[PDB]
Every structure is written in structure tokens, then in C-alpha cells.
Amino acid sequence: GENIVCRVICTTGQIPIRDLSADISQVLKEKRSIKKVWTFGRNPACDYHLGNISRLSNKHFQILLGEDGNLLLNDISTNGTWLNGQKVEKNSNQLLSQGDEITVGVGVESDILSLVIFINDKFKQCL
């Protein structure tokens, strides 16, 4: 966790700004295509804690760092993950872009937690 890969800003008020980081050196060592994984979920063992919301999954979605620095969203939840307002297919990688909005909890207004991703293009270049 040396260099910033992206910044996650929660727009709905529950969580302060958090950065996802990686060490390029350790990333180069990984033989698999996915070089690092960040997990978002209700279980505080996750990299990014979504809170104690029962409709959110313990491990809800993952962000995958690909071989050339692409960021991929993968939904692994019970109740769903939304990307720019659209419910994504479960376990189907989605290529993330600057400013994409990732949302969970849709279906109960009070449970909606929304996040906007800003990607550090410099990290990608450097990788």
C-alpha cells in the first residue's frame, strides 16, 4: 500500500474520503492477471467497510487491479450493485472509468450508500 490508485468519495454522508493504495513493486511480483483486490462489504475484515446494514453483503463487491492498471468492478452480493444508476450483472467484470458512481442498498431509500471513484492516472502510467 505505497501509492494511491484511486480515491473513493462517499456522496451520501456515511463515510469520509478513503484512498485505495498499492505498492507497484509488490504488484509486479504477482503472477496472476489480477494484481490486487480491494473488497467492500459489511464485514469489517474488508478493505472498505460499508457499515452494519443487514441488506448489504458481508463481502459485497470487489475492485480488481488488472495487469496494465485497469480497475474492474465485480459484484458478488446478494442484493445487487449499481454502476451509474444501472444494476450490474452479478460476477461480470465492469471496466471502471473516471467519475463512475457505484451504489449499494438500492430498494430501500434509507439504505442507499453511493460512492464516486476518481482514478490516479499517474499510478497507471507508472505501473
Binding site: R55, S57, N58, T78, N79
Partner: peptide
């Protein structure tokens, strides 16, 4: 807490 998720 870590209970099984409430399913819609």
C-alpha cells in the same frame, strides 16, 4: 455484525 444477509 456478520449474520447471513437479509435477501430482498
Amino acid at each position: 455484525s456478520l449474520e447471513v444477509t437479509e435477501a430482498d
